[PDB]
């Protein structure tokens, strides 16, 4: 029983953040997350504004913005609200709960104040999620757990991936899904977001491996494609994003019937 | 069979950063790394100045500083040079090489400009090291790989730990050791730093587990203890740091003979 994004948004155990995401994916016909790996706030905001209508999510690495300020993130929130997409900071929290709680709430980035979604590696055990969730629950935030990775030599396989799935299931009041290369949970309440995506076959020179939208959404059963250089390196980033959106969207439609 | 810190600093394959660290550990009779998990730059610099004589290393989480600026790291360097300790930013790089390279050099933190040491998780595969190396080698830096973690439910065990050791030994131009709970490499050129250390048994309420300096250095074979709250929460932080220094140092001496 493969359900549309809109119906999954109505599932009994759905987290509010995931429901909001799934509703806008259905409304806008996009399951594309732009990975805005840029070093200038001006470029980040110009990309968010021009590509907002094409994306369900904008993934940030605020630690590579040379001119980060909280005012930049306020402007980004305004665009996310205007164009209707979630903001996902790819922070990869990956330490004991006492530390990650401080990294999520505090410091100069104050990630919890502007990020709808964050992610975490599961290697430290569930305390990483327990620490994050203390901050995220009053703020109605959600978290994605990295169950699989797209890079060569990834150790996020086998029992490690199963441990991520179990951890997500155990913390479903905060964890809304996974970073993975394929469907890893059979529960339709969880989102699957897949990086390592490009239209053409290949990789990079530092261990990144790419698969196509049709492969990851259609055959591997993921929900959302995360695309950075496949868009950001094009001259016309809008046309590139539209190519990726149509690819991922039609791949999703094909598995409904 | 076991070599003093001073003799390890002279080994043919020793990395310069490890050598520099080992030499100052011997000179100052300290194998204590202070974990300065604080929210204010003022507190970071006051602790570095007051406790610098007692430590071989100061471990930072710059992303928890509410008022981070590069001028704070310039002042920290001056203290590190004066008191002779290394600066270890506990960044936990943990993604594909192309991303971590930018995170290490760029953004607001400019970590490579001031951190003698950083660490990385090995879950992405060796690309995480290859990316960091492109920034750290020109800047004469070292990196620690997280082979084991101190937290309940850690997945950094078994084959994962072995994969970390192999990764380190194959990138010895840049990787100088590990975050681990024990000796994980038999090569004396590599340093073992162990967090989760307190004098008394216990843990915290978010999955941290503690072992004593004598257990970690003496029976488990590690080189350096990383201590945060055990010192920072003490009324007399200098006396606490001295207690941890003497404990770890004597356990190291005992192991030698
Ligand atoms: C957890 C995870 C994250 N990213 C992130 O996804 C984006 C992929 O970008 P690109 O499409 O340019 O390779 C980058 O921001 C990267 O750090 C991956 O590529 N793979 C992963 O397994
Ligand atoms: C990789 C790793 C890091 N830290 C860090 O070591 C310090 C431990 O501090 P405390 O002594 O306050 O528990 C913290 O900064 C924490 O994030 C651990 O505790 N355990 C780990 O496995």
Residue numbers in the entry:
A (entry chain B), B (entry chain A): 223 to 479
The study reports:
Orotidine 5′-monophosphate decarboxylase (OMPDC) converts orotidine 5′-monophosphate (OMP) into uridine 5′-monophosphate (UMP) and CO2 during the final step of de novo pyrimidine synthesis, which is essential for producing DNA and RNA nucleotides. Recognized as one of the most efficient enzymes, OMPDC accelerates the decarboxylation rate by a factor of 1017, and exhibits a net transition-state stabilization (ΔG #) of 31 kcal/mol. Its unique ability lies in achieving this substantial enhancement without the aid of bioorganic cofactors or metal ions, relying solely on interactions between the substrate OMP and residues at the active site.
Given the observed binding of dTMP to human OMPDC, we synthesized 5-methyl OMP to test whether a nucleotide with a hydrophobic group at C5 exhibits improved affinity. Using the standard ITC-based activity assay, we were unable to detect enzymatic turnover of this substrate. We could, however, assess the binding of 5-methyl OMP by thermodynamic ITC analysis and estimated a binding affinity of K D = 404 ± 220 nM. We wish to note that the estimated K D in this case is only a semiquantitative indicator, as subsequent crystal structure analysis revealed that decarboxylation and formation of 5-methyl UMP had occurred in the crystal. The most significant difference is observed for Lys314, which is slightly displaced due to the presence of the additional methyl group. Intriguingly, the 5-methyl group binds in a hydrophobic pocket and is sandwiched by hydrophobic residues including Ile368, Ile401, Pro417, and Met371, as observed for dTMP. Stabilization through additional van der Waals forces has been reported to be effective for other inhibitors. , In our case, adding a nonpolar group to YMP or BMP at the C5 position could provide further stabilization and enhanced affinity. The addition of a nonpolar group at C5 could, in principle, prevent a H-bond formation with a water molecule, and thus provide further stabilization. This assumption was corroborated by analysis of the analog 5-Me OMP, which binds to OMPDC with nanomolar affinity, whereas the natural substrate exhibits an S 0.5 of 30 μM.
